[PDB]
Amino acid sequence: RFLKVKNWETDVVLTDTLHLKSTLETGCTEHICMGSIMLPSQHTRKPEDVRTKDQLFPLAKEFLDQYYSSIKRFGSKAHMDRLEEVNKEIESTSTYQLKDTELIYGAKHAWRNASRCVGRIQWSKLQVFDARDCTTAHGMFNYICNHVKYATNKGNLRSAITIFPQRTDGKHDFRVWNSQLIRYAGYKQPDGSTLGDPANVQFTEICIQQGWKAPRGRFDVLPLLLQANGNDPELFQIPPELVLEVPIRHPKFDWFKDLGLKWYGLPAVSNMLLEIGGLEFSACPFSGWYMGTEIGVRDYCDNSRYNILEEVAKKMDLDMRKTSSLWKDQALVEINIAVLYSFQSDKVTIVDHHSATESFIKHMENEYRCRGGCPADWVWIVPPMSGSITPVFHQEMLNYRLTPSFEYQPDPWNTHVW
Amino acid sequence: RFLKVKNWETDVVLTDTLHLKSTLETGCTEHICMGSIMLPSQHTRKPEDVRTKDQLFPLAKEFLDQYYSSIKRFGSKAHMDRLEEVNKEIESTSTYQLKDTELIYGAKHAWRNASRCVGRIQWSKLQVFDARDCTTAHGMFNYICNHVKYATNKGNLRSAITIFPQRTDGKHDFRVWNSQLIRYAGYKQPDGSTLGDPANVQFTEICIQQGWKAPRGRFDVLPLLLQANGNDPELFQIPPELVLEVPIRHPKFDWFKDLGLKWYGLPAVSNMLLEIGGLEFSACPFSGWYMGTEIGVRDYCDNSRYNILEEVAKKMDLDMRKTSSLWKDQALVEINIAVLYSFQSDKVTIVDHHSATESFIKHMENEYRCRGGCPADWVWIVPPMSGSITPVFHQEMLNYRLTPSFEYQPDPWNTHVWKG
Numbered sequence: 001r002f003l004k005v006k007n008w009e010t011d012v013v014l015t016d017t018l019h020l021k022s023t024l025e026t027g028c029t030e031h032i033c034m035g036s037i038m039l040p041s042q043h044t045r046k047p048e049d050v051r052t053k054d055q056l057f058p059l060a061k062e063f064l065d066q067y068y069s070s071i072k073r074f075g076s077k078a079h080m081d082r083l084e085e086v087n088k089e090i091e092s093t094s095t096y097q098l099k100d101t102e103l104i105y106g107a108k109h110a111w112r113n114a115s116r117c118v119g120r121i122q123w124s125k126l127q128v129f130d131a132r133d134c135t136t137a138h139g140m141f142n143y144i145c146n147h148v149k150y151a152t153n154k155g156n157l158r159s160a161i162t163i164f165p166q167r168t169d170g171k172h173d174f175r176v177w178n179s180q181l182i183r184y185a186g187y188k189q190p191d192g193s194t195l196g197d198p199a200n201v202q203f204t205e206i207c208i209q210q211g212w213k214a215p216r217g218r219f220d221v222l223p224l225l226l227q228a229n230g231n232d233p234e235l236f237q238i239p240p241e242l243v244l245e246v247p248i249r250h251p252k253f254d255w256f257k258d259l260g261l262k263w264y265g266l267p268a269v270s271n272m273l274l275e276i277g278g279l280e281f282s283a284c285p286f287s288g289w290y291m292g293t294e295i296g297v298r299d300y301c302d303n304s305r306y307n308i309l310e311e312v313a314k315k316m317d318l319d320m321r322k323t324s325s326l327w328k329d330q331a332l333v334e335i336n337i338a339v340l341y342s343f344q345s346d347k348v349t350i351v352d353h354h355s356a357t358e359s360f361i362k363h364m365e366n367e368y369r370c371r372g373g374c375p376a377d378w379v380w381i382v383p384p385m386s387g388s389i390t391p392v393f394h395q396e397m398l399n400y401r402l403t404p405s406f407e408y409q410p411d412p413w414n415t416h417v418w
Numbered sequence: 419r420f421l422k423v424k425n426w427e428t429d430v431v432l433t434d435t436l437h438l439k440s441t442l443e444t445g446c447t448e449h450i451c452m453g454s455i456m457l458p459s460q461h462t463r464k465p466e467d468v469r470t471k472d473q474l475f476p477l478a479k480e481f482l483d484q485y486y487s488s489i490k491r492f493g494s495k496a497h498m499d500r501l502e503e504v505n506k507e508i509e510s511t512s513t514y515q516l517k518d519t520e521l522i523y524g525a526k527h528a529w530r531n532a533s534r535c536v537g538r539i540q541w542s543k544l545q546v547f548d549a550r551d552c553t554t555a556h557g558m559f560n561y562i563c564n565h566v567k568y569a570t571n572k573g574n575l576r577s578a579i580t581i582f583p584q585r586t587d588g589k590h591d592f593r594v595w596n597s598q599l600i601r602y603a604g605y606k607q608p609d610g611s612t613l614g615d616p617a618n619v620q621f622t623e624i625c626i627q628q629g630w631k632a633p634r635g636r637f638d639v640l641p642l643l644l645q646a647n648g649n650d651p652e653l654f655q656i657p658p659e660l661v662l663e664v665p666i667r668h669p670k671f672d673w674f675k676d677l678g679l680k681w682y683g684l685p686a687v688s689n690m691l692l693e694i695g696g697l698e699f700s701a702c703p704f705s706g707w708y709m710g711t712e713i714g715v716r717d718y719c720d721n722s723r724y725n726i727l728e729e730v731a732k733k734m735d736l737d738m739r740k741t742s743s744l745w746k747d748q749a750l751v752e753i754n755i756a757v758l759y760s761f762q763s764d765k766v767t768i769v770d771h772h773s774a775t776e777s778f779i780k781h782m783e784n785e786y787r788c789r790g791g792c793p794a795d796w797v798w799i800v801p802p803m804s805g806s807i808t809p810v811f812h813q814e815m816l817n818y819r820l821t822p823s824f825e826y827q828p829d830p831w832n833t834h835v836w837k838g
């Protein structure tokens with residue numbers, strides 16, 4: 001019932017009471033742990049699944065109850081009157097609207113409960129842009145551009161989420177088909193390999209399939225593909241002036257820059273579903289700033305990504321004959337030193353994995369005292385390099401699902417009717 | 419029910435039907451995941467929890483069932499008579515003895531089932547030494563020495579395990595107090611600094627208290643502390659000629675040797691409990707060979723261990739002033755390069771993390787093919803550096819508990835009833 005977590009490097013023990021509020025399910029049972037499945041059913045929301053009048057009210061009450069608790073006015077007339085108001089409106093309309101205040105609290109808290117996110121110490125500083133009055137793709141494009149500009153802030157990045165109208169009958173969905181607002185194109189060849197980013201090959205083709213003339217570079221910023229109100233989606237190019245990029249160079253190896261690598265500054269996840277008080281915001285792109293490893297370990301070095309390790313090791317003149325020389329490892333460290341140094345040099349916000357994990361531990365400790373715990377997913381929180389020399393490695397974490405939340409949702413192209 | 423696991427680097431999908439044979443429990447529920455908890459309730463065995471006839475026979479039946487399928491004799495006359503024999507023996511004596519074959523099979527399986535072990539490709543080559551005739555500590559010391567010598571094999575290491583008598587009434591336990599058979603002393607100093615291995619401080623105090631005269635150096639092999647038949651434990655120095663050690667140097671850095679580091683060649687875990695057919699074998703040391711990171715990342719570089727990163731980064735004159743310089747990540751790699759280099763030079767078996775994880779992926783796929791699954795703990799299988807440039811990071815894994823199995827048990831010094 002009450003539950004301990006131990007840091008094995010510091011012997012600190014924290015008691016968890018927050019988990020007993022867990023409203024959603026994990027994927028696990030007494031018989032099988034699923035802690036390392038990317039996408040259990042539970043973590044996804046399929047669009048067929050429209051909320052019914054009966055399921056919606058419980059969800060609303062629970063949400064409004066925590067809302068009114070947070071502003072220390074639990075069980076007050078304003079609490080009670082709101083609960084009735086929303087009640088009535090469900091009874092009549094079969095949905096309800098959130099007050100701005102609730103929208104903002106809802107968004108901040110979905111981030112707060114993102115148990116896979118290492119960056120949550122920052123959860124309370126989110127800028128929320130209410131785009132609920134949007135009606136078209138053009139509108140969405142305008143909203144996104146404003147989001148991007150505000151977030152980038154000349155390199156001094158600021159967290160933001162833009163919130164498009166909530167799902168209704170699931171026929172009128174707003175969606176951003178892009179998985180991130182800013183990503184590079186991926187192209188195959190007759191040759192057979194890949195040019196640019198292999199992660200985006202399909203999506204890159206879906207855009208070309210829609211009229212995108214592609215400049216066919218290794219770093220073509222993909223067009224936004226936007227869908228308002230269940231309509232066919234539309235292509236739009238983000239003004240390059242709004243897309244901050246960093247050329248990647250090494251603080252010690254001047255040959256580094258000769259590979260002509262760069263990366264974009266703004267990580268802005270776009271494909272997720274934001275759920276507040278049973279309401280579904282299926283388009284809610286959000287952004288903050290990069291932990292260095294997301295670019296350097298994963299984006300460059302994952303086999304099925306830019307896979308530059310082989311290339312970097314060669315220029316480093318390391319013994320690539322045998323795994324046991326740790327050449328892959330050696331190179332991985334330099335590549336990451338480079339990314340951090342470039343961003344830092346161009347005064348664009350970035351955090352190293354040592355620092356982020358330190359902050360997250362402070363954050364857990366804060367959440368244990370003030371809230372009674374902090375849901376956390378060790379498989380995702382531990383960074384993908386130097387795992388055990390970061391303090392999160394030695395930290396037991398409890399993972400459970402609280403609401404409001406971000407959830408995954410199927411790729412729109414498998415679901416949309418034309 | 420069928421269950422699917424995806425590998426996100428290769429899109430290989432596998433199907434687990436084996437989880438359906440899973441008896442024990444995880445710690446998780448529909449509403450919590452305890453997958454990152456180190457010692458959950460269910461992964462441990464308190465010695466006060468000694469089994470009744472009541473619960474024993476199903477566990478015995480289950481196990482003998484598994485045993486006779488593996489040798490293709492399910493429902494054999496030999497199978498039924500063994501069932502009735504064991505049954506008669508349980509009602510009569512309240513326990514029962516494993517045949518040699520069953521001990522051998524049980525032990526391989528515990529290993530095969532060890533979901534936190536990346537070494538498992540090797541599970542079928544385990545030398546099992548049956549020490550079920552041992553009645554004393556001195557008997558224990560003698561057995562362990564033969565294990566160490568045989569497993570060491572002049573640097574060409576061989577998996578082995580030594581199995582001492584099972585629990586009876588939980589008052590007569592055999593136990594190896596050591597957590598590993600070979601380990602370096604740790605000494606807290608009055609100024610608060612530690613000399614030798616910080617992991618081992620407590621155990622070192624117990625030893626010193628039990629009579630050990632401590633050389634008090636940075637790398638002193640601790641004596642064995644051994645309990646037989648529930649008796650107070652006794653002390654023994656492994657003969658040094660039996661302890662293979664490898665001085666640590668770096669292929670390119672000549673100053674590295676001057677850090678004065680060395681490590682022992684044989685990883686040999688001695689504190690776990692072996693559960694076979696409901697039977698409990700509370701001293702059962704087993705040994706293998708090292709994955710480099712186990713010394714190079716954890717043993718030297720954990721803040722809570724020899725913590726040599728500072729000194730190695732110093733000597734590389736790295737920019738240690740900001741973390742964002744990755745001086746820790748850089749020092750970590752060099753140290754690990756050094757560890758693999760020293761072991762290979764001296765022809766002491768060792769495996770690097772890339773090579774071990776690749777093997778484990780092949781093992782795992784084969785285990786799905788022919789066994790119907792492979793229980794795996796991702797949190798433990800992924801290496802402690804360079805996670806995502808090894809293929810296990812991208813591998814979805816089902817974790818669940820099968821018997822036979824290796825369990826944790828509480829530290830003997832916490833539970834033992836002193837004879838004085």
Ligand code: HEM
Binds near residue numbers: 119288351
């Ligand atoms: C401010 C800097 C931030 C940093 C450094 C950061 C860091 C991370 C990292 C490393 C991950 C792991 C995912 C991966 O490897 O691709 C992650 C996941 C995530 N973060 Fe953040 N984060 C930040 C801000 C945000 C913001 C603003 C939100 C939303 C408001 C957010 C919500 C999430 C969610 C939902 C996930 C995981 C989705 C899932 O699988 O369930 N984070 N974060």
Ligand code: HEM
Binds near residue numbers: 529532536705707
């Ligand atoms: C062949 C050489 C072997 C290698 C390279 C190897 C590798 C490993 C590693 C790296 C771990 C994780 C431990 C840690 O990081 O602290 C581990 C766990 C384990 N291995 Fe091995 N292993 C080997 C042989 C064996 C043998 C012979 C056995 C028993 C017969 C065994 C049983 C285990 C068990 C039971 C655990 C996990 C303990 C737990 O439940 O928490 N392994 N192995």
Ligand SMILES: Cc1cc(N)nc(COc2cccc(OCC3CCNCC3)c2)c1
Binds near residue numbers: 267287290291294
């Ligand atoms: C706002 C934000 C900031 C940041 N630094 N990093 C992120 C990335 O976090 C997410 C959040 C949700 C999904 C996701 O993508 C999953 C893919 C799967 C393969 N590896 C990582 C990317 C990544 C977001």
Ligand SMILES: Cc1cc(N)nc(COc2cccc(OCC3CCNCC3)c2)c1
Binds near residue numbers: 690712
């Ligand atoms: C036979 C063998 C070979 C090998 N290479 N590595 C191992 C390591 O296996 C274990 C098996 C059980 C416990 C354990 O360590 C547990 C604690 C927790 C943190 N690490 C060290 C002590 C390590 C065994």
Ligand SMILES: C[C@H](O)[C@H](O)[C@H]1CNc2nc(N)[nH]c(=O)c2N1
Binds near residue numbers: 379
């Ligand atoms: C199979 C495994 O669950 C998958 O590769 C996960 C593991 N941990 C991760 N952790 C982070 N931060 N990001 C990821 O994409 C993944 N991938």
Ligand SMILES: C[C@H](O)[C@H](O)[C@H]1CNc2nc(N)[nH]c(=O)c2N1
Binds near residue numbers: 008393455799
């Ligand atoms: C809290 C966490 O479970 C703990 O630090 C675990 C994580 N993964 C590990 N993995 C291995 N191989 N060895 C370990 O000791 C640990 N420690």
Ligand SMILES: [Zn+2]
Binds near residue numbers: 033034035446451453
């Ligand atoms: Zn779990």
